[PDB]
């Protein structure tokens, strides 16, 4: 696949900094481009990671899979450490659209089986149901990359 880690075997010390109010799931793309979960980070916490140059990472809300940014972008790739200094991966909220943010809150409060009991315009039912999905995000990033 287009989006995958390279098996560089060259160590790179990384520090994951969760500068978001969410429980963050780091997702490593393996050498076949398949997303693999790593231990989550509580809000406002940092952790040292032994990663490798050319490995690919993305970050999600662990419970909802809402998208997060890392150094203000979608994917993070360790480089070789200069002067023994670790590379920082600063994980933050994006600015969600107001619509997406409202959908997040509604999903957090209502079981999926009850979405269609809500007194809202009909088009929004399908929007609630179309929850964030890492595989779809990777397809989207892949097509953006190709363009």
């Amino acid at each position: 696949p287009v989006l995958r880690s390279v098996n560089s075997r060259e160590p790179s010390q990384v520090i994951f900094c969760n500068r978001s109010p969410r429980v963050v799931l780091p997702v490593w793309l393996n050498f076949d481009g398949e997303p693999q979960p790593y231990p989550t980070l509580p809000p406002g916490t940092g952790r040292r990671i032994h990663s490798y140059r050319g490995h690919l990472w993305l970050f999600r809300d662990a419970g909802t899979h809402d998208g997060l940014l890392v150094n203000q972008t979608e994917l993070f790739v360790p480089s070789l450490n200069v002067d023994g200094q670790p590379i920082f991966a600063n994980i933050t909220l994006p600015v969600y659209t107001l619509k997406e943010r409202c959908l997040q809150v509604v999903r957090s409060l209502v079981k999926p089986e009850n979405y269609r009991r809500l007194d809202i315009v009909r088009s929004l039912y399908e929007d609630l149901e179309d929850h964030p999905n890492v595989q779809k995000d990777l397809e989207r990033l892949t097509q953006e990359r190709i363009a």
């Binding site: 969760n18 790593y38 916490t45 952790r47 040292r48 990671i49 032994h50």
Partner: peptide, 16 residues
């Protein structure tokens, strides 16, 4: 041959 990421046994630390 294939080397995956791993997390050393260390404490997490607080930000801000």
């Amino acid at each position: 041959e294939a080397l995956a990421x791993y997390i050393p046994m260390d404490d997490d630390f607080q930000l801000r």
